[PDB]
Amino acid sequence: LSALTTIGNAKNWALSPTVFALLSKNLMIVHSDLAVHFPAIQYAVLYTLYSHCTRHDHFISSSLSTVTTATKKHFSIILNLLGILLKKDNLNQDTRKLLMTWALEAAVLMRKSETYAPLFSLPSFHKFCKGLLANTLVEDVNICLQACSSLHALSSSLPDDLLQRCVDVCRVQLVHSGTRIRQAFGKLLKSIPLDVVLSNNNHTEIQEISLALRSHMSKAPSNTFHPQDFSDVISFILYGNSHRTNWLERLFYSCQRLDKTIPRNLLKTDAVLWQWAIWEAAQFTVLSKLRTPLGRAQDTFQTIEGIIRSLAAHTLNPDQDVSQWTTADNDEGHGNNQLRLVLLLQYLENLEKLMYNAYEGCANALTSPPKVIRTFFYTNRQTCQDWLTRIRLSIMRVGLLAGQPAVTVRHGFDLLTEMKTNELEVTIMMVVEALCELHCPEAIQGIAVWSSSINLLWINSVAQQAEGRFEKASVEYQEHLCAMTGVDCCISSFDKSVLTLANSSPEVINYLGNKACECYISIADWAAVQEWQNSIHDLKKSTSSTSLNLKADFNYIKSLSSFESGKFVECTEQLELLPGENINLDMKKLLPNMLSPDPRELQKSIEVQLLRSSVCLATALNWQSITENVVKYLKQTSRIAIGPLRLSTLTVSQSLPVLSTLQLYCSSALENTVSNRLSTEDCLIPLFSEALRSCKQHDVRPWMQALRYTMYQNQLLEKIKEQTVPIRSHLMELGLTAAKFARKRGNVSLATRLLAQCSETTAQDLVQHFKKWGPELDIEKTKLLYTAGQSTHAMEMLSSCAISFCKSVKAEYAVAKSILTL
Amino acid sequence: AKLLPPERMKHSIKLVDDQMNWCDSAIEYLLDQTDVLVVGVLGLQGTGKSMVMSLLSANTPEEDQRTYVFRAQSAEMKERGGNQTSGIDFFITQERIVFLDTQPILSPSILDHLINNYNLPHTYVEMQSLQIAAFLFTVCHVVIVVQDWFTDLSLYRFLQTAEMVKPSTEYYPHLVFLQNKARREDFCPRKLRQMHLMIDQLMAHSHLRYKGTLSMLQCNVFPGLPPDFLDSEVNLFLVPFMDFSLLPGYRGHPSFQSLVSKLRSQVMSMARPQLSHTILTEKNWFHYAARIWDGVRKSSALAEYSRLL
Amino acid sequence: KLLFLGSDGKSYPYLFKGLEDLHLDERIMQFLSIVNTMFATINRQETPRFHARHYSVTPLGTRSGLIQWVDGATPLFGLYKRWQQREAALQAQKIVPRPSELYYSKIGPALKTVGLSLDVSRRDWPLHVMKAVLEELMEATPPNLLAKELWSSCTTPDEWWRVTQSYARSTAVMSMVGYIIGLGDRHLDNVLIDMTTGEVVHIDYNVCFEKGKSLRVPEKVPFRMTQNIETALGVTGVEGVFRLSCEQVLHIMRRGRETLLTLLEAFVYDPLVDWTSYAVSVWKRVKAKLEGRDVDPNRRMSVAEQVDYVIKEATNLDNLAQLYEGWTAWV
Ligand SMILES: O=P(O)(O)O[C@H]1[C@H](OP(=O)(O)O)[C@H](OP(=O)(O)O)[C@H](OP(=O)(O)O)[C@@H](OP(=O)(O)O)[C@H]1OP(=O)(O)O
Ligand SMILES: Nc1ncnc2c1ncn2[C@@H]1O[C@H](COP(=O)(O)OP(=O)(O)NP(=O)(O)O)[C@@H](O)[C@H]1O
Ligand SMILES: Nc1ncnc2c1ncn2[C@@H]1O[C@H](COP(=O)(O)OP(=O)(O)OP(=O)(O)O)[C@@H](O)[C@H]1O
Ligand SMILES: [Mg+2]
């Protein structure tokens, strides 16, 4: 083979079976049985073939079109061989490395010129991509990095079928014990458009992780968890001091035994390790008759109750500064605090499950505990039930603070069932709030109907907010407050006649007021927010309630309004009063101290950082003066914005947060635009019209954030002299999609505002003001008019548009849609 | 928050001095907890026992050899061909796992140093090796055997004869075979089968546990080798050197770090059977080991064996 | 029961049924497949997918056939049985009986304390006695057998919420489909639950098309809504996602009733179908159910009214009190 390599590399064709066919089809038995006992021959054959193919650029120019006639069918063969060799799960390390290098080279060359576009439609290409996807997520780190780089090289111009798998792989790899893997997969995930990341498809990797955890849980207890291990885990979860110097994998290995089944590839994920550690800790706590090293059978309960109560108390007034839970030394401290908060709830749930199974039992779900433990938990069942009932409310509050509505929903359901005989109103409000956060209007309606059998019509209004109908929800909240208080406190809005056609206790009053404020902020109506604040102040001064107050930083709202309005001086002045690091003129400590573990606070901090970076860039523009510093700020912001995604992956959520994902994408886009001065298409946010067919279950807030960060670049284009990428088309596309979603949920005011800004309080006003995306804009205007209530005017305009389109040039879908709708 | 750990040993401590005396200084680092694991190793002059213990207890291949918890050999010392570790060492990791590093057996350097200092020193060194081997086989759970070149034909005889000189339904610690500084030829199916067969024929009456544990095939070391290819996969592991026109770029074996990590994971999960018919704690185990050492020192079988030669 | 090993190294179990036509069962599956296809449009804008689990059946002639064996699902009856064993264990601290034995033991004294005996005809049985026995049996069993099982099966609260929602949606979909097609004999052994996803699966279909209304003991329940089934849906019961899902399913079926009627008509005039004017009657009954004229001379009921009426009739204590002993209504 080595001697033949001399003629294989020659570039000069008959002469017996050609080298390509000799090493491609003639020598194929070496990959079946010889590769197991003699891998040297297989490696030599693959090496000589690679050396011969790399000289002619893998015969890429021969296709899509003498020597060319014979080589016209070589690229497909190369891709097919690479793919078939990659799906094998019994390859050698050296062979796999060589194949990965070959695949990376081919992938990089396959985007070199535009002409190779048809090559992406060949079946061999799909087979090759499948092999690349199946080669990652392996024990080897270098192999995974190479596969990720190759996949990211040709991320674009790839079918969604492989994109979904890429999304799942990136999501699972976001929580790895190695920093290189996380950093490499972050870029790949960021390169995928938002129209696919926010899809409602199922993730296979997450399912595999869940299955492994379930299999381990269903097994019988091993009783190998030593007291020191429990002490260290509890110390880290309660105080943050692990007292250990990759300490999870080592512990897991030390807890196993070879004398007496989790996959080996999953041992490198921190999510599986954390869940296993929590389950083992709870198992040990239950099997130890509650006599854990933390104290006696009552000391553990007292400690948990005290910590939970302190957190619950701080939740009501986020100005308590609980020790070891609100202060951090750097940016990693806050993330660790959030992780600990989630682990605490997980541990409590596991403990409750084990106790119930110990005193009652299950069927094939969990093995029965020993008799000595069963009798102990059977005689002292009343004490455990009473303790859980007493701390249930605090647990629900903590769950709401940690952004885990499932915990509070389950606890609220259990509490409601136990109260089969005014602590009921608070429980109902908490359950309704959690349901609203989980976007489940049906559950809210059911709760309202069930509670009506015991004067709580306001619950129905909350259901509307869960569906995304903010315009109607605000009006309903105002009416409810006016009826429960007796004082007029409404705010000017759109005509209720068409608005309704298109779609007491102090705690309840405060809850409704805060709900209306958040509802107004969701649609990005700063004027409405100011009017609402004035009305609330007037109502409070006219009732002397002394217990009503909106929980929202007005400085942040004013800053956002000033930034969106185009005024930067007032924006900078407002931002200067916010907490955290001063505005750009150390990098690790960007977040302020005494920060609450609430995800909303983190989102607010990230938004403030983005605003500061944007203002600094605008001031600097009117290339390393104010560029070497803003880049670091944006990089750190992006590093902090990935925390929520990792937390979501830690648990089997099967979904990704929308606000967090959007913030991360916006930060990446801002960093790219700052480092490139709007020179490449990568500086634009990936929110196209495709999302209109795969993100119909999301609210309008995503488009609001995207538009807020896109208008900035659109208006900033006037301060750039060099050639830039076209942004008007992207902005108009975003505006049209946002208008469609806003109109589909009854938000007539927001839809009208978006349509008006894209085209550049009464039903007749819209008629008098309205009577490559031209046809789409006209169709949307007609649809909005019809939804408002003017069917005749909308039909007339649609008919006129149809006649005008029939005489156009293309009019492919315009004429069809116009006549069909008519 | 009074559940702080005892202490984190930054370096090992000599448990047995060169004069073969028991040192009572490791009790302060032990607690009153049960279910403890102990590890021991028997090797030659330059096999690399200290390096293995360092890499498996509290060290990584990236760390410098000067910061190893176990004093390893130095290049400037290999010229004289002398030993580096004397007596027995002690060190406990953060996972409550006890490690023990011993001196080389039948080391010519020890004999040479003893010359310039009851019948002949050869018998003295022989009995010393037998005593250390018996103590390890008596108070250890798993014993790893390190080797440089295969087919020694002498280590097996020593291990077999060491089991008949122990002080006291008997306890037999597991024996793990490790091949250090393995070459590319050793990572071949034919060579692997030959090694397995040779070990099986050489340890027919070992009477110790050396099969069904630490399977290298189950560790995905050989992805294509089927489990039925080997008649009886014994507990054998390979460790290559630290990190060609016919085969350019072909290594022939996995990375050194990967194999080291795999061995560490397999050893950390070894079984911990009861040494005696009573539950022993860290302090209890230390006391038992001290008593066993005192008893084996002034024994009778060892004296008879030494007198016979 | 046999097994087939495919090329992908995946085992597939099958049940070889004999002494049965199996031709109508194949038609039922095709109908279910079309119904599932009708939910593909909405399934793209809602997390809990609208699906109707079903298997594949292939007749191997005229009296034999093969049926796909669904794995990963377990019958609900098993859970109940396990509970009994656990209770028995308690009796040992300080052989479980068959449902028929328990029912007879509880109905004996009740009938003897009023005047009748065990030799009287089943039709001449007082309603109060049956209601009292049913109430006693209901109060003697706990309704947390299914809720606690699904709760303990999950790993994290998010998984628990997802599984609960999926189970409620699947139960509502199957309830509406079964009521429209006229499924019967919905005993505990004929219902399976998937702890991994929460979906419900049905097995027997030989007592379909209102065939259960004419037996030794007629049944007046559109579907199964026992204590354990209703308790696993949540604290509200059947007033939450269950009712809305049922209304949506009925709306989709009513909108596209033309395709269902055409398929049924084609099924009626099929030589390879053993219906024993019976087929015409079945077709008319299904047509009336789909059109909303189930029980009314000329008044067409709405989707909400139909759902409410079916739900009330499926949970009425009077109907559940006069059912067969095998069809355990207390659990
Ligand atoms: O506003 P569009 O972009 O034209 O959306 C339309 C239409 O919207 P409208 O409800 O406002 O008419 C409907 O959307 P959904 O009801 O699914 O939310 C749906 O048509 P239906 O009203 O009949 O359901 C579907 O139209 P179609 O069914 O023809 O696919 C859809 O998209 P297209 O009109 O572009 O196809
Ligand atoms: N597709 C299937 N998947 C899994 N289990 C099945 C399947 N089909 C049938 N079974 C099981 O097979 C069992 C035997 O059914 P069986 O009760 O004999 O039906 P049948 O005989 O046709 N009706 P009957 O004569 O009244 O008993 C059922 O109770 C189910 O538990
Ligand atoms: N896998 C390896 N690759 C390269 N060098 C190695 C390897 N293993 C050991 N060595 C080297 O060989 C020598 C082994 O001496 P070391 O002190 O580690 O233990 P030892 O041979 O058991 O000696 P002693 O019994 O005298 O303490 C050192 O110089 C070490 O650096
Ligand atoms: Mg050494």
Residue numbers in the entry:
A (entry chain A): 615 to 626, 632 to 684, 698 to 877, 881 to 895, 900 to 1060, 1067 to 1099, 1103 to 1151, 1178 to 1259, ...
B (entry chain C): 169 to 285, 293 to 343, 361 to 435, 454 to 519
C (entry chain A): 2139 to 2232, 2245 to 2426, 3607 to 3661
Paper excerpt:
The PI3K-related kinase (PIKK) SMG1 monitors the progression of metazoan nonsense-mediated mRNA decay (NMD) by phosphorylating the RNA helicase UPF1. SMG1 is a member of the phosphatidylinositol-3-kinase-related kinase (PIKK) family, which also includes the ATM, ATR, DNA-PKc, and mTOR kinases. Despite the confounding name reflecting a possible evolutionary origin with a lipid kinase, and in retrospect the ability of some PIKK family members to bind inositol-6-phosphate, all active PIKKs are Ser-Thr protein kinases. These large, multidomain enzymes share an overall similar architecture: a C-terminal catalytic module (comprising the so-called FAT, kinase, and FATC domains) and an N-terminal α-solenoid (that typically serves as a protein-protein interaction module). SMG8 and SMG9 form an unusual G-domain heterodimer.
To address this question, we reconstituted purified wild-type SMG1-8-9 with an excess of AMPPNP (instead of SMG1i) and subjected the sample to a similar single-particle cryo-EM analysis routine. We obtained maps for SMG1-8-9 and SMG1-9 at overall resolutions of 2.8 Å and 3.1 Å, respectively. In the reconstruction of the binary SMG1-9 complex in the presence of AMPPNP, we observed no ordered density at the substrate-binding site, consistent with the reconstruction obtained in the presence of SMG1i. We concluded that the autoinhibitory conformation of the PRD in the insertion domain of SMG1 is connected to the presence of a nucleotide in the ATP-binding site and is stabilized by the presence of SMG8. In the binary SMG1-9 complex, the portion of SMG9 that interacts with the N-terminal HEAT repeat helices of SMG1 changes conformation, exploiting part of a binding site that was occupied by a short N-terminal segment of SMG8 in the ternary complex. Indeed, two hydrophobic residues of SMG9 (Leu456 and Leu457) take the place normally reserved for two hydrophobic residues of SMG8 (Leu351 and Leu352). Hence, the conformation of the SMG9 segment observed in the SMG1-9 complex is incompatible with the binding of SMG8 to this part of SMG1.
